[PDB]
Structure formats: structure tokens, C-alpha cells
Amino acid sequence: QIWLKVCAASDMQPGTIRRVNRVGAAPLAVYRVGDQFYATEDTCTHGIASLSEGTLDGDVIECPFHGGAFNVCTGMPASSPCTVPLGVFEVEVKEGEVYVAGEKKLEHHHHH
Amino acid sequence: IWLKVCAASDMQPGTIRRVNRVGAAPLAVYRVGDQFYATEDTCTHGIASLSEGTLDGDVIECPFHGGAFNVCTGMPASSPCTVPLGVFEVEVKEGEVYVAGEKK
Amino acid sequence: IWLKVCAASDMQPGTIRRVNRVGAAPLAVYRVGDQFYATEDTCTHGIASLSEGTLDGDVIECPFHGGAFNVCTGMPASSPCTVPLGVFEVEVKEGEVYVAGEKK
Amino acid sequence: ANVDEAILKRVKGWAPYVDAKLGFRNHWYPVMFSKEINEGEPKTLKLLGENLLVNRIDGKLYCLKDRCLHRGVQLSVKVECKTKSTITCWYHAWTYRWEDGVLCDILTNPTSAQIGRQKLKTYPVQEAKGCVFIYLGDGDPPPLARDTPPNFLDDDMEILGKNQIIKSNWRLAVENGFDPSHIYIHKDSILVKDNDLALPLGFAPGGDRKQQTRVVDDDVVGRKGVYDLIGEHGVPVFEGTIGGEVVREGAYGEKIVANDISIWLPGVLKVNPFPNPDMMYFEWYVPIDENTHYYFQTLGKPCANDEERKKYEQEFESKWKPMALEGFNNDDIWAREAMVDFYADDKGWVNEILFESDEAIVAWRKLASEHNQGIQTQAHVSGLEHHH
Amino acid sequence: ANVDEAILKRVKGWAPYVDAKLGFRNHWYPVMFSKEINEGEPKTLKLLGENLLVNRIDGKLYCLKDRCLHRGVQLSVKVECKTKSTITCWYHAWTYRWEDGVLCDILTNPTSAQIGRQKLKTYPVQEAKGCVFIYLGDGDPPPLARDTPPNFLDDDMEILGKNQIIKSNWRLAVENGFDPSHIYIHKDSILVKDNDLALPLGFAPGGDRKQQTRVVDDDVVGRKGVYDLIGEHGVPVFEGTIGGEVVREGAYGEKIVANDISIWLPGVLKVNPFPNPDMMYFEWYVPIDENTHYYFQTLGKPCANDEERKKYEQEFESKWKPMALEGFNNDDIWAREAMVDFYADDKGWVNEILFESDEAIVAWRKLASEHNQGIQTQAHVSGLEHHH
Amino acid sequence: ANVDEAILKRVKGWAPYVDAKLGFRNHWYPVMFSKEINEGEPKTLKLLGENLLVNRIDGKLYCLKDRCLHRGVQLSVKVECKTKSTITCWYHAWTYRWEDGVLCDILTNPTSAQIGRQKLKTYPVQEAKGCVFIYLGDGDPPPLARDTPPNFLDDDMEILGKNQIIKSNWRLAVENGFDPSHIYIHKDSILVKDNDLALPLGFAPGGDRKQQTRVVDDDVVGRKGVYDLIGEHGVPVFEGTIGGEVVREGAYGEKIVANDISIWLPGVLKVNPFPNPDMMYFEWYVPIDENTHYYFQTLGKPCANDEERKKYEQEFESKWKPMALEGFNNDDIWAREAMVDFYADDKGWVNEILFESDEAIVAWRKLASEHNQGIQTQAHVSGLEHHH
Ligand code: FES
Ligand code: FES
Ligand code: FES
Ligand code: FES
Ligand code: FES
Ligand code: FES
Ligand SMILES: [Fe+2]
Ligand SMILES: [Fe+2]
Ligand SMILES: [Fe+2]
């Protein structure tokens, strides 16, 4: 269950967001920026809002609760009042099928 | 019954003319384009004379507080006015403007 | 009487030069384009040096509070300044700038 | 438009609610108890920012805006009710009828053209369960039931209570009241021990978001509200821990109460059963102005006869009022006051960091934004402004 | 620019007046009685929003702005008059001459280039009829007669009075005083009964509106004012009715007072004769700031000798001051205060609903708007501003 | 950001300083004395407009912002320290560690996703010379020495003092303290006579502008400040004259004090020697909010052992505190307050008319504008804002 099957790449239009629910775990949000796919936790770090119900502006997702925002590629805050980075999950497309990582990316074994 | 105001030519479009009546409240005659209208001269929101106000199209603005009315219907157009203005009959016969001695 | 300040070319357009005088208040010489003017250097509203201010056309802006004066008439151009600046006639002969010794 | 547009633009889920700093217009609101207004004795009060006057004539209540049409003075500065059906302004004697607000006479000039042509604003007033409700709105009012919690108007339901002015915006009072986790502030209430109540410290949510509440928008009476269902799938917290060690315990009393909690527009909470298994509690947070509200508390208990009513009143006075309405709810008063600073500049509506149980508050904010009957504005207070 | 431009645009008949919240600059104003300021004893006061200091030197009065040019502190915090003709700031000792406000010395630096190069604002001060008038304006002042009601300065006129600070904008005071129908608030005054005055409840106007007032656009001394002529062709109302029934009656005394009432710029009312046939009454409503004014009351009676003046003084103290100045006018004080809220947000100037007798107030508003000598602004208080 | 842009544009020489109404962020500030904060006894205070909580745990001081992340209430309304290293909000039990402000537990919901994922703001706290300094800034703090005057931290310098809240903006306090000519307000201080001090009334400056001060920006520890050198070329004024005649003289005592006076960022003055030839005086004017500051006074005297320290302490209590800190500096308190009105609308920063000795103040304004570590804004108080 390292890679979670989400949907067919063609099932998502550019600039859309899809929520991925997981048993016994917090939901994720998969974003399609152009022809690329990204994913983060679905719950806004500033509260209890669902980012999949927000608005995607390019590679920046805006929370529907207070207007906070995050960069979907890095998970870093883009607009106040958000200050806590989102956990980011790797996404890959195999056979035109979108898969999202079951574990978040870590500042472990990567670029210095 | 109908009282003589003036000749339709004495009033330029967009002008107002006060009509004082003996033993009665004054009226105001407005020429909107080529049509004439009449209402009480006194603003329903106070004691101002609407004939001293500003006419913009078919709407007269009171000089006291800026309230306004539609000169055709007499209905309030701008706050603080809320009480409809009394409308009086007007007819132009032989190039002369006439106003009904009573409201409709 | 007249004080020889400097060569006209010693000042770039739109600049100000402070002229110190022993036993007397310093003066400010302004070069507006190709013309030269002079006033007392100390702002009349405080202790600021107008030669350290901003010249906008023929108006000198004090660096302290934004007060201003017309360098030609010496009259205040912007608040908080209210007391007129002392003006000194300036004369340029043979490329040399001279400033009157006395205010006038 | 009572709040910075920049802020309203940020709270897309409940902007109308955030803008409703002065409360919602076109709803009924309780302002006093029937026994507080006597025949022919006008009483003043401020509701939704408007100064009002209430009078009882032939036993029926009437409400007139307490502001003369002439120079805008409050008639109440010097009350002059010269005939049973009218009130005369103390300044230039403009006289108004209580039943329709019409300017019927002017003692300083009986020939004035204003007589019979102007009208002072009147508001509908209705008495129910010994409570005085005023419809702060325009046009014919809807039935009172629409703006009251279920059962409040039941025939057998005997209502008793208290009212007072509290220093906080009405919304802070509403949210605190419907706040599932604020139960923590009541852990040391005398009602807990003195009435052997079962009271957890909080709740560990369970189930999905939708399951946390029940939004009511299909009530035949038109009622609009939200039920707090956090306890249906949640695990009540009776042992609070820090670093794993228990530092606080809930109340292990035998009496089970407050298992049915709901908030209703325009802003009234229903707690059942409370403060005792055989009673029902209702409390309103009525907007007086942007900084204050009436904390209208009412407790109901079915009574079939005068004997039970008398007995009920005795217990209310000797136990329920002091032990519950005050001994329990007093902590709610300073709690709401504690949030004033954070929301005073309207910034709290953006910077607040919510957690799971606030799902109930969010549901309320959305319900209120979508179903309120109007936003009261300062212009309603001074005089509506427009140009069409 | 003291009021929202949107409001000023609406009141086309008298925008300058509505904008004059701080009063009219360039007019004389009474601020205290001569006996209140003694030789070498500086006194503080606030006029048109400006803090002032008045001193008596060699019997003559001098007025300096109570704000040091250096760091803007009030000199009065710690008065240091080190020489008869000067005052030294307690902070850094900048010293000013009372005569012309010139900065003549600086004790902390006798070599400062500022000495003789700065001037503290001074205002003309004149004493007349035992009253201290200050010309709160710029340049050479006009004769005091221009800003006083007719006869106030008559040689034989003996003036006695009272002064106090009242919490209302000066304009609310002026309008109430010149208000023909406000007479209704005086129906129960002890003066009416104790001095057997005839006093109607109001008036039913007669004639055209032009006949309701008499505007004086110019006097031999440039006075500007308006007389209330509602009683010229109007019918005095002595029976107040509601629905046709008499609920109140006016006073049927034999003494007829207030033959003529006139208001004059900058804001002083003359009632003649009052409160008795042999006397004349004048009252000023002097702007202190946007929320308060001096209620400067004066009673005049022609006296030919010291004997008559003495008798008059006795009558004033034992009867007229308590029965009229207080017994009659105290009701005017709370009446003014009652209008504060409605006009506080400047909206009352738009929402007021005027009636016939207000023709007097309207005439005053227009006269004041057309002939005032300047609008005092907050910038006059802090320091006039202007950028090139 | 805190002042009208039009005003800031006018003061091009020190706009940052004029905008710093709330003080400079990222600097150390003393707020109380060590003996005032005891073990497990949380204390509240407001610094740079922010509400803070300070506590001593196992002897070490910790500082947490006194505002729960949840609904923005002050934790101090009802303090709940359930474990030695944490504090629990009284509202919904969100629990924070004093050590790093991490939200480590939530009693009302132990399953909350917020746990361990939020952090309450904390600020570095350091005790030195019996004084508690808080670094009101972000990131790793600089050495305390950078924000203290020279010698304050000397090994043998025994520090004693007093602190209180004064009603004036901190800058008015700083300027009055460094004001060379304000010495005039101290001419009658009991300290002058009682301690045989030599004290002039002011100074006649000498030399050019540059010579009036010494701007320090080469200090190795990074401290930034200005020395007042007016007395190096100036002639002290002992005979104050008006019109050339002597009206006041300075003090001809034998003891020479205040040889060197210097002001340092963030706002602390050093006067040496003072109030006696063998002591050193330092005073801070710490911003609490836009209208108030802490007047943190400290007196230092070299002591080699406990005997001398105890002796000094006794002299401090019986003489130096009442005679100098109060008997001398009390006049500085009302002097600062006297400037409040002129600068309250921010216009005094434009209308002030300065004279020669103010060169010292100007030098400070420029230094502060160029070397401050950040301008505190209202957004820092409510929560920093940033869009897109
Ligand atoms: S919950 Fe997302 S910005 Fe607040
Ligand atoms: S009198 Fe016409 S708008 Fe008021
Ligand atoms: S010192 Fe020049 S404007 Fe103030
Ligand atoms: S203000 Fe009420 S009658 Fe005039
Ligand atoms: S403030 Fe008056 S001399 Fe300095
Ligand atoms: S406001 Fe502190 S835990 Fe909720
Ligand atoms: Fe509660
Ligand atoms: Fe009166
Ligand atoms: Fe001092």
C-alpha cells in the first residue's frame, strides 16, 4: 500500500482538486497543475477546513475558511494566516493511472 | 379647476416653476423635455420648496437634505424622503400650461 | 559688499551650496537650471540646513519637516513654515557667482 | 456592510454572519419579562442598536421607536402620555398613537401640515410564557414559533428565568453556548457536585463531518437551527492527561443531562434535559449594540396545575436559579467576555485556529449566513440611505 | 472639511453651517467676567478648540495661545511669569511677551538664533459691560459692536450674568434658543407662575413664510441676525388638544415678555423684554470644542446712577438669577443635551423632519452660512497645513 | 505602517523613528526585577503591544505570548498549570510547554490532529543584574550587551532600581531624557540642594553641528547610541536673563555630575556620574503600547563584597531612591506627559519648532531610524498578514 491508486489521469481536468480518503488515516488532496500532479494533506494546517473544497490558483491552493493558502508543490504557506507547512505526498502516473504515496515526503535522504 | 401657469415656451426643458395659489399651498411645475408635470411645492420631508431644488431628468432633488421624488409619480426617489408627493393634473392647450386646482 | 561664492560650473543644475560666513548666519546658494538664487541657509521653522534639503524647481523643501520656500521670493511655499526667508540678490558675471552681502 | 470588505472576502463560508455585527433584522427577540412592564408605565430598552419604548395599554403591549421624528430626541427623556392611546414629545409636543405610530396631533401647532402625514416606527410585540418578544423587523411578522426552539411554547411548559446585560457581541455568546468543548469551563461548577451530575471534560470525535451535527432546514414551523451530535459517535473524556499522566477527571455523577443541544436563529440555545433530567433549558443572546447583548435565560418544567407551578417556582428560586442559571452559567459570562479583544477588530474571524469540535460552530455560522432574515446596519439605526 | 463630504453635499441650503462644528473663526466671543481675572493671575480656557491664557497687566487684558512653540506643551502646566511683561515656559525657558507674543528670550540658551525670530499666537481681548471678549481670529479685529446684539453696549445698560460649561455642540444651543415652538418646554417654569407671565404653548403660523422672520443683513456696525416674527400674524396657542380634547393649557398671566427675539452671529440670542418688562436678556453659546460650549447668560437693565445699579444687583441676585437664569433656562440645558445623539454622527442634519415654526431655524442656518467670517478647522487647532 | 504616510513623507530625516509608535522589534527590553517573579507564579505584562506571560520554573524564566492559539483568549484570565512544564488554557484545555510553546496536549480532545502541530509564540528571557530582560523579537537573539549601555553589565557594578508604568509614548520619554536643555525643569529639585550639586540652567552651544554629539556605531559589541557633547564647546548658563536682567540662577554646588550623557537603542539613557560622583545611572523607557511605557530606573555603584552591597542597598532605600529616582526624576514624568497632546495626532513631529540644543535629539532620531532592528506594527500584535 506504498502507492495509493487515485484515478485515471484523464479523470482530472487541469486546475482541479481531488480528495483522497484513507481508512484509519487523514485524507489527502491531489491537485492537477497543468499536466502535472501533486498531493498534500487535505486538512488545512490552520484549522479543520478541507483544502479540496478551496480554490486552486496555478500551483497555490486557497483555503475556503479564512483565505490562507499553500504552494501545492512544496506545501509551504503562501498566504496568512497559514504558517504550518503541509505534508507533501509524492505522486506518479503509471499506465495513465494516478498514484499517491501513502507516506509523506521527509527532509530525509535528499538534496542538502 | 384648472389654473393658468404660463406659456409652454416660457419654460426651458429641465426647469422648475413655482405656482403660488391664493389661500392654498404652493405647487411646482416641471418641464421634463417637452412634457409638463406638477406636484406640491413643499417637500414631504420638511418645509423646503422643491421649486428651489435641482431637476435631473424626471427626478427633483430637495435643497434641504437631498431627498428626491419622481415628478411624474410623486414617489420618493432618494432618502430621507418616504412620503409620496401629491401629484396634480397638467394639460397644455393652445401652447399654454394649465394645472388642476386639485390633486388626482 | 558682494561676496564671490564660486564658479557657476562648480555647481551642477538643481544643487545647493552652503556659504559659511564668519560672525554671520550661513547662506544657501541654489542653482535652478542655469539660474542662481540665494537665501539664508537656516530654515525659519527650526535649525535645519536648507542646503541639505530638496530642490524642486524654484522651491526648496526643508529636510526636517517638509516645510518649503520659494528660493526667488523667500516666501513660504509649504507649511509648517510661516516666516519668510531672507533673500539675497545673486549676480553672475564672467562665469562667477556673486551674492549680495546684505538681505534684500 | 459592517466589516472591512477585505475580511469578508476571506471568510467565504460565512461572510453574512461575520458582517452581522449588529445582529439579524426581521426576527423576534425576547427583551424582558411580562411582569416587568406595568399598565401605563412606558419602559425603555435598546434592541439591535435602536432605542425603543414599550407600553402596556388595556393589558396589550405596544412598541414605538424612542426617537421623535422632529429633532431626534428620545421621548423617554421626559415622558408625557397625555391620553391613554398616545405619547406626546416633551420638546415641541408632536403626538403619536401607540397603535400605529401616526403623528395625530402637535400641541405647539395644531394647524401643521405634518399632522396625519408622518409616522413613527412601530414594532410588533408579543407576550408568550411570561416573556416579552419584539419583532425587530419590517412588514407583517412571521409566527413567533419560527424564532423559538422546539417545545419552548408547549402548553404545559412553565417558563421561569432571568435576564441581564452582558458586555460582549452577541455572536461570542452564541458560539460559546453551542461550543461542545467549552464544557471544560464548567468542571468546577457547584451544580456538578451539588446536583450529582455526570459531566465529561470534552469529547473525542467519531465518524465523519456530516455526522457531527444535524442541520435543521425542514422544520414545518420554519425554524432554522443545528443540533450538536458530537456525543453520538464520540468518546467522552473523563480523564484529562498531559504527557500521559492524568491531571484532571470529569464528573462521575449519576444524573445525565445536556445530551440534546441545539442552536437556533436568531440566536437561542436549547439544552435538554438541563439542569436536571426532568427540565428543559433555553437561553437567548440578544443584540443590544455591537458590544453588548441581553443574556435571556429561561428554564422550563412541565406543570399540570398551580400546585406544581408554585412548587416549581420555589425550587427555581431556592435551587435552580442560584445553582444553575448563576452557579453554572456565570462562567459562560466571563468566558465570552474573554474573547472580546481577539474579535474586536474583526481579525479573530481570520486568525482563529479551530479544532475538531468547532465543526458545530462552523455549521452554525453557515446556517446563520444562509438563513438569516436580514443584516442590521448602522443606517437602519440612523435612518436608511439610498438613491435608487 | 469637518464633516463627511457626502453629507455637506446634501445640505445645499446651509453647508458652511453644518461644517462649522468647531464654530466660526474671526468673531468676538465672551468667555468670562472681568471680575474673574485679577492683576498678574493668568487664567486658562479653551475657545474654538484652542487652549488660551489670559492675563491682566497694569489693568489691561492680554491673550496668548497656551502652547509653547518649541515642544507644544501648555505653558500653564507650570506658570512662570518672571517679569511683569513676560511668561517663561517651564520646560526650556522660551520666554514670550504678553503684548505681542514675541519670543524675546530663552534662558536655557541666550545665544539662540530663534530669539526675536518667532512669535506665539496672540488674540485681541476687550472688556465691555464687565464681560471679557476674545477675538478668536486673525488680523485687525472689527468693532466688538458687530458681534453683539443691539443695545447690549448701550451706555446706561447695566449687565449682570452667569457663565458655565454645557455638554452640547454650540449649534444645538443656538437652535433651541431661537426655536419658536420650544416654548412648550417652559410651560411649568417657576418664572411663569411666580412672575405672572402669559406664555402660550406654541403658535399657529399666519402669512407667507417670508413674513415669519426678519433677516438683518447689515447694521450700522455690520451686525448679522434674524428676528422671530411668528407672532406677527400667527395665532398664539393656549389650549393643547389631542383628538379634540384639551389636555393642556398655556399660562394666562398678565405680564407679556419676549416682544421680540433675535439671534445674531456669531451665536448670541436677544430676548426683549425678559424676564420682566423693564429688562433685556442676551445669551451666548460659545464653542469650546465640538462637544461643549459656554452658556454665557447676561441680563441688562438701564441704570442712571450708582443707586439704581446697586438695587438692580440686589434684585438680580435674590430673584432674576435663580428664578429666570436658572428657573427658566435650566430646561433649555437638558433640551440641548437631548439632541446630542441625533446630530453626533452628523446624520441628524439630513434626517431631521422640520415643521412650520422651524422657518426661524432655517433662516438662521442660511444667514450663518452666508455671513460667518470663517470656519474653524482642526487644522487651525494643530497648525494650518498646505503643500506646494 | 503606523503613521499617516503624508506625515512620514514630510520627516525624511527620521521617518522610521516617527513610524515606530509601538517601539522597535528585535531588541532586548527590561520589564521587571528578578525578585518580582517567583517560582511557579506566572506574571502578566504587555510589551510592544503584545500580552505576555512570564513564569519561573526550576529557577529559569520562560516567556509565552498570553493568547491562546484557539479562540484568542488570554491564558491569564484563569491560569491552569497542571504540570510543572506546561500551562493549560482554561477554555478548551489546549496545553502548551513553557520551554518551546508547543501545543503538546488538549484535554478536551486527546485525539485532535492539532496536537503537536501548533506552536504558541515564545520569547527569549534573560536575567542580569537582578533585572528581567525579554527579547521581543524573532529568531536567535543577539548578546544582551548590544542593547545595554556601556558598564551596565560590569562585574562589580551593583544594580538597584525602581519600575513603574507612565502615561506617555516611549519616544517622548527618550527625548526628554537626552534633552540637554530640559535640565531647566530640575532647577528646584531637592537633590540639587540636598546633595550639593552644581547644575546650570542650560547651555550656550559652541562649535559646529558634528561637535555637539558623538554618534557611536563602532562599538565592538554592536551597541548603537549617541553622546551629548554640548558641554565640550558650550558655555554653561548659570545666570538666566530676561531683557538682560538676571531673574534666575543655576546651582553652585561642589559636586560635579553628568559628565557624560548618552542614549542607546532600543531606548536607554546613561548618565555618569549620577546622582553622586561615585555612581552610574541608567534608565529605560520601554514601550508597552502607543500611549504608555515602563520607566525602568536603575542605579549602579561598584561594590566588591556583600558588606558594601548591603551598605549601598541601605543608602539606596533611605536616600538615593527618594532623593534622586523620585526627588529628581519625578519632574521628568510630568514633563513627558505634557508633550502627549502635541504629538498624539502625530502632527507634533511636523509642527515642533526646534532650537540649537535639539541637535542632540535629532542625532538620536537619525541613529534610531538607521540602526533599529525592526518596526513593531499592529499586525505583529494581531497576527502578521500577507496575501498571495
Ligand atoms: S482553516 Fe485554512 S486558513 Fe484557517
Ligand atoms: S425637507 Fe426635503 S429632503 Fe428634507
Ligand atoms: S525646521 Fe524646516 S520645516 Fe521645520
Ligand atoms: S423633537 Fe419631539 S416634538 Fe420636536
Ligand atoms: S516646550 Fe516650552 S521652552 Fe521647550
Ligand atoms: S481558547 Fe484556549 S483552548 Fe480554546
Ligand atoms: Fe457553558
Ligand atoms: Fe428656552
Ligand atoms: Fe530630567
From Swiss-Prot, chain A:
Activity as a function of temperature: Optimum temperature is 30 degrees Celsius.
Residues binding [2Fe-2S] cluster: C44, H46, C63, H66
Coiled-coil residue windows: none
CDD domains reported for this sequence: Rieske_RO_ferredoxin
pH and activity: Optimum pH is between 7 and 7.5.
Gene3D superfamilies: Rieske [2Fe-2S] iron-sulphur domain
Residues in Rieske domain copies: 4-100
Membrane-spanning parts: none
Function (record text): Part of the multicomponent carbazole 1,9a-dioxygenase (CARDO), that converts carbazole (CAR) into 2-aminobiphenyl-2,3-diol. Acts as a mediator in the electron transfer from CarAd to CarAa.
Protein name: Ferredoxin CarAc
Species this chain originates from: Metapseudomonas resinovorans (Pseudomonas resinovorans)
Swiss-Prot record, chains B, C:
SUPFAM superfamilies tied to this protein: ISP domain
Keyword Iron-sulfur appears in the UniProt entry: yes
pH dependence: Optimum pH is between 7 and 7.5.
Temperature dependence as stated in the record: Optimum temperature is 30 degrees Celsius.
Residue ranges annotated for the Rieske domain, each copy included: 3-99
Cofactor(s) recorded in Swiss-Prot or TrEMBL: [2Fe-2S] cluster
Residues that bind [2Fe-2S] cluster: C43, H45, C62, H65
GO terms (BP aspect): carbazole catabolic process
Record has DNA damage as a keyword: no
Cofactor stoichiometry and binding remark: Binds 1 [2Fe-2S] cluster per subunit.
Coiled coil (residue ranges): none
Molecular function (Gene Ontology), one example: dioxygenase activity
Lineage of producing organism: Bacteria, Pseudomonadati, Pseudomonadota, Gammaproteobacteria, Pseudomonadales
Extent of the signal sequence: none
Complex and partners: Monomer. Carbazole 1,9a-dioxygenase complex consists of a terminal oxygenase component CarAa, a ferredoxin reductase component CarAd and a ferredoxin component CarAc.
Organism for this UniProt entry: Metapseudomonas resinovorans (Pseudomonas resinovorans)
UniProt entry keywords in alphabetical sequence: 2Fe-2S, Dioxygenase, Iron, Iron-sulfur, Metal-binding, NAD, Oxidoreductase, Plasmid
The name this protein goes by in its record: Ferredoxin CarAc
Summary of the function given for this chain in its UniProt record: Part of the multicomponent carbazole 1,9a-dioxygenase (CARDO), that converts carbazole (CAR) into 2-aminobiphenyl-2,3-diol. Acts as a mediator in the electron transfer from CarAd to CarAa.
Pfam families recorded: Rieske (PF00355)
